Curated annotation (Swiss-Prot), chains A, B, C, D, E, F, G, H, I, J:
Full-protein residues shown: 1 to 99 of 140
Organism: Homo sapiens (Human)
Complex formation: Soluble monomer. Homotetramer. A dynamic intracellular population of tetramers and monomers coexists normally and the tetramer plays an essential role in maintaining homeostasis. Interacts with UCHL1. Interacts with phospholipase D and histones. Interacts (via N-terminus) with synphilin-1/SNCAIP; this interaction promotes formation of SNCA inclusions in the cytoplasm. Interacts with CALM1. Interacts with STXBP1; this interaction controls SNCA self-replicating aggregation. Interacts with SNARE components VAMP2 and SNAP25; these interactions allows SNARE complex assembly and integrity.
Principal location: cytoplasm
Sites bearing N-acetylmethionine, chain numbering: 1
Disease: Genetic alterations of SNCA resulting in aberrant polymerization into fibrils, are associated with several neurodegenerative diseases (synucleinopathies). SNCA fibrillar aggregates represent the major non A-beta component of Alzheimer disease amyloid plaque, and a major component of Lewy body inclusions. They are also found within Lewy body (LB)-like intraneuronal inclusions, glial inclusions and axonal spheroids in neurodegeneration with brain iron accumulation type 1. Parkinson disease 1, autosomal dominant: A complex neurodegenerative disorder characterized by bradykinesia, resting tremor, muscular rigidity and postural instability. Additional features are characteristic postural abnormalities, dysautonomia, dystonic cramps, and dementia. The pathology of Parkinson disease involves the loss of dopaminergic neurons in the substantia nigra and the presence of Lewy bodies (intraneuronal accumulations of aggregated proteins), in surviving neurons in various areas of the brain.
Entry function: Neuronal protein that plays several roles in synaptic activity such as regulation of synaptic vesicle trafficking and subsequent neurotransmitter release. Participates as a monomer in synaptic vesicle exocytosis by enhancing vesicle priming, fusion and dilation of exocytotic fusion pores. Mechanistically, acts by increasing local Ca(2+) release from microdomains which is essential for the enhancement of ATP-induced exocytosis.
Gene label: SNCA
Protein's name according to its UniProt entry: Alpha-synuclein
UniProt-reported outcome of changing residue 57 to K: Increases oligomerization
Amino acid sequence: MDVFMKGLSKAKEGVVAAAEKTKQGVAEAAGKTKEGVLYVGSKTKEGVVHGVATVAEKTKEQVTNVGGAVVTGVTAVAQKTVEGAGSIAAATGFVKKDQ
Amino acid sequence: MDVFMKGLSKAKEGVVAAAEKTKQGVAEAAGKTKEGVLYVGSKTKEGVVHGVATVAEKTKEQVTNVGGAVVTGVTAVAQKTVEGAGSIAAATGFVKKDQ
Amino acid sequence: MDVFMKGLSKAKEGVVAAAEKTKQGVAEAAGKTKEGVLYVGSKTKEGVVHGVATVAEKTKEQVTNVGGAVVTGVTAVAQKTVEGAGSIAAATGFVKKDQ
Amino acid sequence: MDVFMKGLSKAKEGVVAAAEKTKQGVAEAAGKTKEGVLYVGSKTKEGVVHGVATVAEKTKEQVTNVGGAVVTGVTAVAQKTVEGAGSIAAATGFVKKDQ
Amino acid sequence: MDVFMKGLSKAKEGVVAAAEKTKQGVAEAAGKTKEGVLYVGSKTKEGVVHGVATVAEKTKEQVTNVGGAVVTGVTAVAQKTVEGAGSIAAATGFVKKDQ
Amino acid sequence: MDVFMKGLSKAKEGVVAAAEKTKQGVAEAAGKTKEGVLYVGSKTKEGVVHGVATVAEKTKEQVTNVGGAVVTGVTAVAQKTVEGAGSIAAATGFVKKDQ
Amino acid sequence: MDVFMKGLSKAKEGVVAAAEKTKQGVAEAAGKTKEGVLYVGSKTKEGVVHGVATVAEKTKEQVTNVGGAVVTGVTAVAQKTVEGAGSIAAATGFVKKDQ
Amino acid sequence: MDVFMKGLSKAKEGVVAAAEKTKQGVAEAAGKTKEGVLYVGSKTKEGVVHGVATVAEKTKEQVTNVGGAVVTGVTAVAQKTVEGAGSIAAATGFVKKDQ
Amino acid sequence: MDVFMKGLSKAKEGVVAAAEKTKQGVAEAAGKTKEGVLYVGSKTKEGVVHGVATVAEKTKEQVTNVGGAVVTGVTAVAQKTVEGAGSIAAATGFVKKDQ
Amino acid sequence: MDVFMKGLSKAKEGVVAAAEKTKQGVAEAAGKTKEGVLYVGSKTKEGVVHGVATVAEKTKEQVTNVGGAVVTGVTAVAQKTVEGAGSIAAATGFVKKDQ
């Protein structure tokens, strides 16, 4: 009367292989201005800059020349992960009872 | 009378292979200005910039020349993942009882 | 009457292999202006800069020339992870009772 | 009547291999302006700079020339992790009762 | 009637291998302006600089020339981790009762 | 050829009496929130109170009981300028060439 | 050829009496929040109170009881400028060439 | 050819009496929060109180009881400028060539 | 050819009486928070109190009881400038060539 | 050809009486928080109190009881400038060529 999840009962020469959130050869990137943020009765004058900014309140003239490159952003690359023989195994099982 | 999920009962020479959220050779990217954000009675003057910005309140003249490139953004590439022989196995099982 | 998760009962010559959040050959990157932040009755004049900024309140003239490159951002690369033979195994099991 | 998680009962010649948050050949990077921050009735004039900044309150002229490169950001690379034979094993088990 | 987690009961010639947060060949980097910070009724004029900054309150002229490179940021690289034969094993077990 | 205003020419035994804006026994009152006011590019949060006020921005409960009198206003009284004989003369003239 | 204002020419035994803005027995009152005020690019949080005020920004409860009198205002009284005989004369003239 | 104002020419036994802004028995009062004020690029948090005030920014409870009188204001009284005989003369003239 | 103001020419036995801004028996009062004030690029947190004030920024409870009188204001009284005979003369002239 | 102001030419037995800003029996009062004040690029936290004040920044409880009288203000009284006979003369002239 066995209540089981992700397992095995009875049997003979049994193999159990379980992988949860198993990351192999992965690339992750994240850029977040706000995450898990809570404001309760708050007066905030905020300002986040990713690149080139020219900020003023009172001015007469205001120029912003960009002769070059402004490269901003979130990038993740998995260009190659497996080459030739071999393998990347997750939760792999076997029972070879040969002769 | 076994209540089981993602498993195996009885049998003989049994193999159980379970993979959940198993990421293999993956590329992930994320750019988020706000995630999981809560405002309760809050007065916020905010401002997020990803690139080139020219901000002012009172001005007479205001120019923004971009002679070059402004590359912004979220990119994820999986250009190659497997080359030649081999494999990327997740939750793979077998029972070869040959002779 | 065994209640079990991610395991194995009874059997004979059993193998249990479990991997949770097992990271192998992974690249992670994260850039976050705010994470897990709580404001309760707070008046904040904040300002985060990632790149080139020219900030003023009262001015007459205001220039910002960028002749070169401004490279900002979150990057993660898994260019190669496996070469040739071998493997990257997570939660892998076997029972070979041959002769 | 055994209640067990990530294990094994009964059996014979059993192997248990469990890996949790096992990081192998991984690269991690993180740049965060705020993490786990709590403001309760606080008046803060803050300012974080990652790059080149020109800050003023009262000015007449204000220039910011960038002839070169401003490279900012969070980067993580796993360029190679396995070469040739061998393996990176996590939670791997076996029972070979041959002759 | 054994209640056990990450283990093994009964059996014969049993092997238990458990790895938790076991870091092998990993590179970690982190740059955080604030972590675990609590403000309670505090008035703070703060300012963190990572790079080149030119800060003033009252000025007439204000220049900031960057002819060279300003490299800022959080980087972590796992360029190679395994070469040739061998292995990096975590929570690995076996029972070979051969002849 | 005399050009004259408020006067007298030629004649004989002449009397000239001129009164301009001559105020006698007068009561003047004035209450003005603004007079001769010029706003040029101005952001003003202003507030003038003449009496009883209860001002708040964020509240839960807000009561204002006035059990008594709130007397506000501009008043001016000329009650008894002349009594009995006499006079209040402005620009009064005479020529009595009797015997 | 005399050009004259508020005067007298030629004549004989002439009398000239001129009164300009001549105030006699007058009461003046003035209450002005602003007079001759110029704002040029100004950000002002102002607040003038004449009486009883209860000002707050963040509150839970806020009461203002006025059991008595709040008398505010601009008042001016000219009650008894002249009594009995006599006079209040302004710009008064005469020529009595009797015998 | 005489150009004259507020005067007298030619004549014989002439009398000139001129009164400008001549104040006699007058009461003046003035209450002004601002007069002849110039703001040029100014950020002012100001606050003028004439009476009873209760000012706060962050509070829980806030009461203001006025059991008595709050008398504020601008008052001016000219009650009995002249009594009995006599006079208040301004710019008064005469020529009595009798016998 | 005489150009004259507030005077007399030619004539014979002439009298000139001129009064400018001549104040006699006058009461003046003035209460001004600002007069002839110039702000040029100034950040001022100011606060003028005429009476009873209770000022705070952060509080829990805040009471202001006024059981008595709060008398504020600008007052001016001209109550009995002249009594009986006599006079208050300004710019008064005469020529009595009798016998 | 005489150009004259507030005077007399030609004539015979002439009298000139001139009074400018001649104050006789006058009461003057003035209360001014600011007069002839110039702010140029100045950051001032100022505060003027005329009466009873209770000032705090951070508090828990804050009471201000006024059981008595708070008399503030600008007052000026001209109550009995002239009594009986006599006079208050300003710029008074005469020519009595009798016999």
